[PDB]
Each structure stands twice: as structure tokens, then as C-alpha cells.
Symmetry: D2
Subunit: 386 residues, 4 copies
């Protein structure tokens, strides 16, 4: 089975299946896809909805009449298919004017233009029903040390987000923001490089409750971090507003492989976490079909994204349901991890001799954790060898 239906909340950006295959060393290997045809083809595949950057839907520099016309025909395909727009974003990285950033460009006039460009697209995203507005500052950063004073750049980043927070509050919009972290590329180093850095930054904004994170699998893996661990921290903070799924095979350039490819065990632990934590947002795929592929390989790749999530969902649920796994978890004391360390308080802990002076350190040091047996049960379930 593993057939996606709308109920599975699978979404795709216009820019993913529509990537023409232009990379740093080569030209486009595929023609551009029309936005109406992408909506059509994804609804046929079992997708729930689509997302967009403003310049994906409306070619940069369009007159107001060309814009209207682009939004009308898109909105029509959405009505015709039952497709939703859960999220939208701004392109603040392609046009040469953003070569030193959008919100943190050294030129003040470019920072003002970046904000107006964003605000215009927040109005459109709300009209189309988007609840989450993503911000990926891919050009915010530097290749050299004196080019960007980072404390002042963070003053300008906080100013920009506070300004957008005031704007949606004044308009009464029901939209929240999600910051997408990336450690590098296209800049040598990008500001707010990981989930952690974006979550700490949010706590310094004027209205923190309006902002969360949109982590991407491949981005945290570009810094060699454990993506399931970063998502668990964002969930613990109540800040996982959206998530971008794809694959990455290690620390190198950002590959955007289809979900499931790259680190397959990390994809298994991520699905197990999303499903057991009850995440209810879109399962969004931000990937690129390899430029070796024609348009049928594009839809084959898009279908494999959804198929791999559904296969892993089944294996993670079977794992957690297994009495032998529930037994191995008690053996590794994951139940004791859930008990408070000292709900009796610091003064009872300090007067407790079994916690220190009479604690038998070597009896405790000799208890094996039985983590390898547990992990081989997880490997067996992933591989269907049970």
C-alpha cells in the first residue's frame, strides 16, 4: 500500500519539482514548469498542498496586471483540485540586489526594500489561507570577518522581525513566522546557523509567541548535527511551527535529496519522533529532483518522498508497539528517565545519605545499559526483519 492521500498533509514547494537543474557548474537540464500544472500533477500524486516564494508565482518585475493574472490562474487551479497553501515565503536571495543580504544588508535602502518585498507577500499569503510564513535568510552572513559586524547585524535582524510582528498584529492577521536555519551556502557563514541559534534569537524578539522555527533535515546535517535531537529541542520549546523534509549525505554542499535518501536511520528516528510527539503541521518536502532526471524522474522523485515517509511511519509504529521493544525500553531504564530526579526538593536530597555518602558507586557503575540490544531491535524493525 503506502499510497499518499490528502489526509497525510504532504506538501511541496513550487520550487522543488519545478527546479530546472541549474547548479554552480552547469545549466538547466529541464524546462520551467507552469505553477498551474504543478498543482494539478501534485494533487494527482496524493499531495495535500503547495507552498511558494513570491518570485516562483509572480516573475520578479511583473506589473500589477501581470501579477493579478498570475494569482488568478493559480488560485483557480487550487479551487479546482482542493489543494491548500499552508505556507508561503519571500525570495530574498536570487536577485543581485540581495548579494549582501535582505534584512541585514549593509546598505540601508536595500534593507527597507527587503521589508516591503516581504510585507507585500505576507498580504498575499494570508489571502490564499497560509498560516505560517517562513523566513530563510540565505544571504544574511559573510565570507570575511570585517564585512559584517554580527552584533549590529543581529540588531538589524531583530528590528526586521519586530517590524513584521507589528505589521501582522496591526492588520489582525492569523499568521505566525517560522525562521529556517542554514549554517552556510550561499554565504560562507550564515547568521542563525542552526535550530539552536534561531530558538535563542526568538527569545529576544518583542513578541516571541509569533515566531518559531522551520528546521530542514539537510541543513542541520551540514553542520554534522543530529536532526532528530534538534527537532526534540524545538518541540520541547513549543516552537516547531513547520518542518522541511529531505535528504543529505554528509557535510558538503546542500544536496536536497528526496526524503529517505541520505541518512536513512536519521529519517527513521525523525518520523518516530514526529508521530509519537503528535506533530500536526504539514510534512513539507523541500527537495530538488537530481538534474540527471527528466520530468518523469521529477514526479518519480516527488512520489518517493511521500512513499518513504509512509514506509518509515509504519516501521516506527510497529517498533513502538512491539512488547519486546517495550520490554527492552524498561531494561534500558527509559521509564526511570521520566521520573523526576528530586521532586522531594534540594533540602531532602542534601539530607539523603543514599544519594551520596552511602551511594554504591561501583554497583551502579556495573549496571549495563543494554542499549545495543534495543538498537538492534530498532534496526530489525526498520529493515522489516521483524
Amino acid at each position: 500500500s503506502y499510497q499518499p492521500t490528502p489526509e497525510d498533509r504532504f506538501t511541496f514547494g513550487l520550487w522543488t519539482v519545478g527546479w530546472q537543474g541549474r547548479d554552480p557548474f552547469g545549466d538547466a537540464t529541464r524546462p520551467a514548469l507552469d505553477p498551474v500544472e504543478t498543482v494539478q500533477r501534485l494533487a494527482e500524486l496524493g499531495a495535500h498542498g503547495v507552498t511558494f516564494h513570491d518570485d516562483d508565482l509572480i516573475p520578479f518585475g511583473s506589473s500589477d496586471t501581470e501579477r493579478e493574472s498570475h494569482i488568478k490562474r493559480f488560485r483557480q487551479a487550487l479551487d479546482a483540485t482542493g489543494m491548500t497553501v499552508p505556507m508561503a515565503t519571500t525570495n530574498l536571495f536570487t536577485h543581485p540586489v540581495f548579494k549582501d543580504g535582505g534584512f541585514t544588508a549593509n546598505d540601508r535602502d536595500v534593507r527597507r526594500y527587503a521589508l516591503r518585498k516581504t510585507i507585500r507577500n505576507i498580504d498575499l499569503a494570508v489571502e490564499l489561507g497560509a498560516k505560517t510564513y517562513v523566513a530563510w535568510g540565505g544571504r544574511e552572513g559573510a565570507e570575511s570577518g570585517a564585512a559584517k559586524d554580527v552584533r549590529v547585524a543581529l540588531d538589524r535582524m531583530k528590528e526586521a522581525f519586530d517590524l513584521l510582528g507589528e505589521y501582522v498584529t496591526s492588520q489582525g492577521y492569523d499568521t505566525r513566522f517560522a525562521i529556517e536555519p542554514k549554517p552556510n551556502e550561499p554565504r560562507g557563514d550564515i547568521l542563525l546557523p542552526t535550530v539552536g541559534h534561531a530558538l535563542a534569537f526568538i527569545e529576544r524578539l518583542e513578541r516571541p509567541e509569533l515566531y518559531g522555527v522551520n528546521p530542514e533535515v539537510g541543513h542541520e546535517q551540514m553542520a554534522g548535527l543530529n536532526f532528530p535531537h534538534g527537532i526534540a529541542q524545538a518541540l520541547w520549546a513549543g516552537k516547531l511551527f513547520h518542518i522541511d523534509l529531505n535528504g543529505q549525505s554528509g557535510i558538503k554542499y546542500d544536496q536536497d535529496l528526496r526524503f529517505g535518501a541520505g541518512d536513512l536511520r536519521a529519517a527513521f528516528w525523525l518520523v518516530d519522533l514526529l508521530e509519537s510527539a503528535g506533530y500536526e503541521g504539514p510534512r513539507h518536502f523541500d527537495f530538488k529532483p537530481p538534474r540527471t532526471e527528466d520530468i518523469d524522474g521529477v514526479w518519480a522523485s516527488a512520489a518517493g518522498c511521500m512513499r518513504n515517509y509512509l514506509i518509515l511511519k509504519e516501521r516506527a509504529a510497529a517498533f513502538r508497539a512491539d512488547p519486546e521493544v517495550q520490554e527492552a525500553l524498561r531494561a534500558s531504564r527509559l521509564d526511570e528517565l521520566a521520573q523526576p530526579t528530586a521532586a522531594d526538593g534540594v533540602q531532602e536530597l542534601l539530607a539523603d545519605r543514599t544519594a551520596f555518602e552511602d551511594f554504591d558507586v561501583d554497583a551502579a557503575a556495573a549496571r549495563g545499559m543494554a542499549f545495543e540490544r534495543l538498537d538492534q531491535l530498532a534496526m530489525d524493525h526498520l529493515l522489516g526483519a521483524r
Copy 2:
């Protein structure tokens, strides 16, 4: 010149110059140093003070009389040399009982013991005059996915730090805590893996003002991150309580090279930031003299740490003082980065046609940033070619 004096606030852990050279594949190549002799030799080198883990000063398992005796003779060398103890920490990673962690061990009784072990050493660190108490959770984490539920582990981590916050508040101690992030090693992945992750975690503690970060050069570089950028975020947050200086040559095992070795340009931008931001805490070295070295190579390595900071301090100050550099910074518009984007407010920005409808995008896109000329002036000053 480049001669360290106490005034330069250079500090060293007992565990740094005293590392015997035991690594994963080999035995100790040097004898243990007595703590009194380390104090002596570092005061002679121009060091301001020393730090310790409890088990560095008092051998694990010492009776109360062996403990008293170890603290008396140490305290005596400190009085005799004028050496200070600015910071202290707990060893919650060497003894086998901490094989699954201290504060986040799955076994509850080990988590209670880890807290009592810590509290006993907070009392001693306050008595010796330490103002900062560092927490490096090196055993908090996992090699496999089901071994550690990370949301619950963070419940236990927050519980532990809140418990220590209540303890020092109740005792009226003037000590703050600093969390030291590390992405991996000795665990496959460590919780709170970077500066960003530790800063976001602190905002969820009961008394956030009691906690900051103690970043280490080599640790952020093990995730390929820009260490000067991470320190700028911690300074912007008002959370840089302490800093550990050393060298790392890339993403690999944690090398702990002497400061200045590893990424030399990153060391130059770090000193430029510390000195221009007015950091006033200790310049602490957490490094390991290579096990190829005898005890004279140990003191040669320790002296090079301080010499390299003083050379880079001089080159960074000369750079910033140069009128030609001040001119290149105006040319790259670092002065415009300091201007507010929209102090006129969102409604004036929205009614400003020069910010969007009449903005000349291509005139702005054509302005070069002159960042390469600026960076070659920084290279010239670093190398003393001006």
C-alpha cells in the same frame, strides 16, 4: 615584548598542562603534575589564575581528611603566589558510573548522585573565590536513537539546573553558572551541542539570569561553525560569562591545540571581537600539550597560548586604528549597518515610495561591497605587512 602579566587575566585549568597524554589509542607519556607545582609554574609564566574540576584537586574517593589536606596545601600555594581561582567545575564524565551521563543518566539514583557531587564542589569553589561555575555535560547524549528520549532528557536537564539555582539562591552565593556546549565526543551526539542550543535552553530555566555560556573555540569548530559569529550572538544576548580558548584544525576529534594554532584567522577575528566588545572575564585556556612533548614542551605550549593572544591583540588593535581601514569600512558601508532600517516605523515605511515602487533595484544591485580590499587590509595587518 608580548610578555604576559597578571593584568592580562590569563587562566589555565589544572587538567590542561597536567594532561598526562593518555588518549583512545595510547598510554600516558608524562607523569602527573602536583597541583601546587602547577600553581607555581603558571604564576612564573605570567598567568593570572587557575581552574579545576573537583577530581583534579581531590582524587576521587578521598576521605574527608585526605580532602582537607588537598584543599589546604593548594590554598596555600595560591596565597603564596597571588594566583586566583576565577572558575571551577565538576568532573561528571570520567568515572564509569557516569557512562550514560550525570544530570540526564537514565538511572535516577545516578542523577541524584551527580547533583550532590556538583553541590559539594559549588561550596568549595565559592570558598576559594570562584565567581563562575562551569557545567560541561560531556556524557549527556547518546550513540543510538531509542536510548535517550531527548524531550524527557531536557526535562531532567532543566530540573538539575533549576535545582542548583535554588541551592545557590538559598545559600546567598555570588556565583553564576556557565553551560559549556560540545557537539559530540565522548558521546555520539551530546545534548545542547552548540552555543545556540545552550542559549535557547537557558531561556526555559526558572531563573535565566543565573546562567550563561562558556563557549570553547574547538567545540564550535567541530560542527564547522564560525566561532567569532557564535561569540557575537552570546555577547548580543548578554550571556558570555566565560570563554575557553584553544585551537582545532577542522571537523575531527577534539584536539585542544594551543591557542593560535588551528584556524589562525578565526583566532584573529575572535580577539578583535573580545577586545572591541570590552569582554572583561578571564581569557581561559583549555588545551592539551601534545603527548609528543615532555614537561618543558608543556610549559613551552602554555607560554605560546598567552604569546599568541598578545600578538593577535596587537594586530587587531593596529587594524582597527588604521585610517585606511576606517576608510575601507565606510566604503563597505559598515556605518550604514549601524543605522536603524526603519526608525520612522512600519506605517512610514509602507507609505515610502523610495523603499519599493521607486526604488532603483539595479542601481543598488550594481554597487560593489568592496569586501575583498577590506579583507586584504585585515590579512596585511595580521601578517605585519603593514
Copy 3:
């Protein structure tokens, strides 16, 4: 399920299940294992043989009488179980005399001592039946640039291996040598860091036929390289003499996880390669049971190594046997890669206008490669969803 047999050629080092758990930040968590108990327990698990470093078997410093006793007891356990010894190696990294190397130490006398220690163990390995003698220069390298002139050190490395070749040739021994590459750890950089570098060096020895490589999964992955691609090149060269199997989750310290853990798709493509190329040597596991484990967890991790190889062997055989995969391989023109580019020579090619002057570049550019549809069939077979 999936039982290990004799004919599977699974072997283990004495140092793998015998690892006591000591790492750079912690003490041993397990008791030392007796070599004869290791032989017994591994025979019980379905292993075909065991390997050893000389100091695993005979304690460094044992007179020629305890050496006698140690070899006698050990050979007894092998006699009793039918266990074989396919390979042996020298420990030229643990003792402090090897702190700057064995074969390439700057001190001449340490290099002579290193060669005498190796030759003593080549005699023992041959009489126990080993056909392959592994060299892992863990200490050959540097933490700094002027400490080691690498061209001269390669002269010394070549000299050591040529002298070893002369010795086994004058003795008439059947044994061949296999270099084990590793990019770093315990040295900042190790000489002959990858499979590629070791294959090139072998070509400069006086008897290249006596020497091949012994690549390890996690070591090539410490440099972010594709381990199956590196094994395909060692097999193309006719130099894959032995292989070390384990797991690694990224570029970081050497983990030595059990085979299957780490990069699970790389383990699948490795098994598919080994089995389709008909590699017939030992499937040797060089891994470390995590120090979180007691001795039951050690045997559970050793059994998981074998189980994972056998599950992947079955999934890879099913992938290649599937008629739809054979069809997808023809569709991606994997059969056409096996056809010679220009079997009728360079003047044939130059005289062919369809190769240049009349080649339709756009029709060729538009053929899709259908690689994503082939990779999802491989993904379905691995996960048993086919």
C-alpha cells in the same frame, strides 16, 4: 532469524569485544577479557576466526617464557574450537615509545625497534595460519607542519615496507601485507590518509605484488568519502586484500559502531558490491561495543554485526535478482556503460562525424537518466517493502 555460519567468514579482533571502555574522557567500564574465553564465545556465536595485535595476546614486557605460555593457551582454544586466525597485526601505537610513530618516528632507534617488534609477530602469525598481515600506522603523522618532512617520512615508510617484503621473501612465507588507511586520530593528520593514498604508495614499493589495502568503513567516512566507491577502486586495482567493517555516523571522532549502524545505505551498497564482485576474504569486524554496555551487551553488539551483514546480503541479492530492477538498469543505460567508448581506436573516432560534427547534442541532453526510479527500487528492497 539469519544465522551465522562458518562459510560466511565472519571474523573479529581480540581488541573489539575485548575493548574495556576506556576513552579520552573516561575510565574503563568493563573487565578485561581472557583471549581463550573470547575464542570460545565467538565460536559459539557463529564467527569463523579471530585476529590479534601482538600486545593483545602477549603483554608488552613479557619474557620469552610468559610469551610461550600465552601462545600455548591461545593455540589450545583455537585447536579446541576449529577457530582460524586469518590475519594478525602489530601494536605500534599504544606504548609511549611510539608517541611520534613506529616506521616514521624521527628517532632512528625507535624505527629499528618498530621493525624488530613487527618481524617477531610476522613469525608468530605465519605459524598460526594468518595469510594477511595488517599495518595500521596510527602514530605515523603530525599535529604541526615542521614536525614531519613528509617526503622523507615517505622514504622511511617505503624503506620499512621494503625491508618487511625482503624478510618474508627470504623466509619463503606465504603472507601478504595490507595497509589500513585512516585520515586522523590519534594524530592530527595521519600519513596515507585514504584508500587512494595507500594504493598510490604501494605502487612505489620494490615488490608491489606483496601489498594491498585493508580499508575500514568508518575511516573513509571520517573524510566524508563514499566507502563503496573506494572499495570499487581497490577491487579494480586488484588490491582489496582484507576489509574492516563497522559503522560511523559522520565526520567526527572514530566511533567503531557495530556494522549496520551509522550510514545504513552505505552498508547496503558495500554488501551489494562485495557479494557481486565475489570478494572471498574475511568479513572482519573492527568495532567497539559502546562503553555503556556490560559483557552481555558486548556479545549482543557482536551478534548484531553478523545479523546486519546477513540481512543486507539478502536484501541486495533480492534487488539484483528482481526483473523490474534489471529493467530499470537497462533504462538508466548501465549496460551501455560496459560497452567500450571506442574499441576501433582513435582514428576511427576522429573519422566519425556522428561523434561530433553530426551528433545531436540537444536530443542527447534531453534523455532522462531515470536514476531516481532505480534508487527508489533499491530503497524498497532494502526496507523489505518489496
Copy 4:
């Protein structure tokens, strides 16, 4: 200061200063440069020559008449300046027909076309005076495991290079070939990923003498390797035919920063090696002026490449000439590494009791190597603090 002369052999690719700034997330920021203006401007800066890909000089698709005109104008600028063309290469990566490779494309016809396109440019390079023809197989590789059988692809790679060797031998051309390794990007994994892998492959060609390597600083650093060590092995092998100089700050996308930027101490040890080994080929810069720059910044970045090499050349010469460094090298026994381990052979060594039976292992283990004191002298010379 530090002026570039002719005799310094500094060369640049047409594609380096000519890079228009287009990357995977952004459009070109600079106008295209005319090849004759590039020749003029670089002659003015003190460059000795220029290099080119065939499609840098002649637009893909130009008839044999625009080809004529393009070569004529270009040769005119060279005639007028005295600029030389030391090396040339083929673009087998930009056009979509090369999406799965040139020499190792699965389609036979694309491989024939790739060889005809290369041979056409070998004829042009020879008449312009190039002695080295570089091959960079940027598209040779895969993003997935069954897309490319690597043993067969190495058969095709060897076949392509053997046919090129036959062609230049039957023409009597003086030119030699140089393989440029790169571990990844634009392919997930590229074949012959490091200097080591390319040196081993060369040993399997029918005429190994015609082929060497062209390593690039940032490409070996993309795999975390030590670039000076890799160059020492290519020089030991007699295969350093050419070298590409630039900067890279870590394992991430290929940056191509100007030489000196990135890992500055690695650039110091590289210059020290090149100058002490008497390398006499071009010092070629393969870098990209950041897209933040206008054309004045492009020429400022190109001048910085040359300046940095000349400052490092001077600092490295001063380090080796210093009597205290010569003394520190004797103290670290760098003179003793040059002495043969056992010049009087294996039976000499076996008969020597001072090599084993009477060698005092503890006195040898306790000699310190004094490597930190030597490295701080190197650090003092680099920073001009001596």
C-alpha cells in the same frame, strides 16, 4: 608592498576573474568579461599567463568561422602583452549533455562526443604553447549507488585517458596531462575524489609517464585532508605537474576564495613546501572573486592572491634561514628522520640486540619531541613577530 614579477609564474584562469557571480541560489552580479580585456588587465597586475577551458574562449555552438575570429583576437592580445598560456582544459561539465558525465557517462555516444570535444582543444592548446592539459571530471560520479558501477566506470575512465595518450603520442605533441581531483560537488560523489585516488589510477594507465595531478587547495580541504601532506606525496611520486591555489574555510561547498584566505597556516606550509622542493611550474589561481564585488573588487581579489603568496614566501624563507629554527629542527630530530632506518639490511637489523633485546624502551619513550617550541617559532615567523 611585495610586487609580482614575470619570474613568479603567477597565472589565472579566464573563468576566475571572469566569474559573473551566478551561484545555485542567485543570479549573476557582474557583466561578462572580454577575454582580451582579461589578458590586458592581468598583464598589468604582474601575472605571467592565463589558462582557459575551450568554452571560456569559444562559445559552445560557434561555427568554425566564429571559432577562427575568437582564437585570432585572443592570440592578438597574448602577442601584444607577452602573456603565455601554460595550461588549458575542456569544459565537460556545463552543457546539459554532460549531466551524467563526460568520459564516464552511461550513454556511449556522450562519451565519444566528450573525447572529440577534448581532442579539438588539445590541438588548440598545443599551438598556443600549453605544456599541461588539465582534466577535471566534475560530472563523473553519482548521487545514488546503482546509477554508476564504479569498476566499469573506471574502465571507461582509463579507456578515455589511454585514447588521449595515444592521440598525443601519434601527433608527437609535447603536452602532458594532469588530473584534478575533487571529492564532491556538483555530483554527490565524484570519481577519483582525492590526490591519492588520482595518483593510484595513473599507475594503471598504458603510458603512466604522460600523466600527473593538479591538486587544488580547497578540494582536498573539502574532505578535511592536509593539503601540504598531499602535495608532498605527489612530489614524492614525481607527479606534481601543476597546482591550483585558492582558499577554503572548512568542509562545505567549494568556495574558491583568493589564496591566503581560508586556512592561512596551511597556505604557509604549502608555500614553504613548494619553495623548498623547488617546484618550477605555474602558481595558478583558481578562485572566484565573491559575488558581493564589482569589477574593481575582482581585480583587488586577484592582486591579493599574488600578494599573499609573496608575503608567505618571504615568511617561509625567513623561518628556514633562522639559526634558532635550524637548531630547533635538530632538537626535534628532523635530521635523524633523513638517516636510513637500516641501510645495512634485514639480517644486520635482526642481528642487532640494541634494536630489540637491549633497546631501552623507557629512556626512548621519555625523550620529548620539542615540537611545540618548533611550531611556535614557525608561528612567530608567519606573524612577523620575528
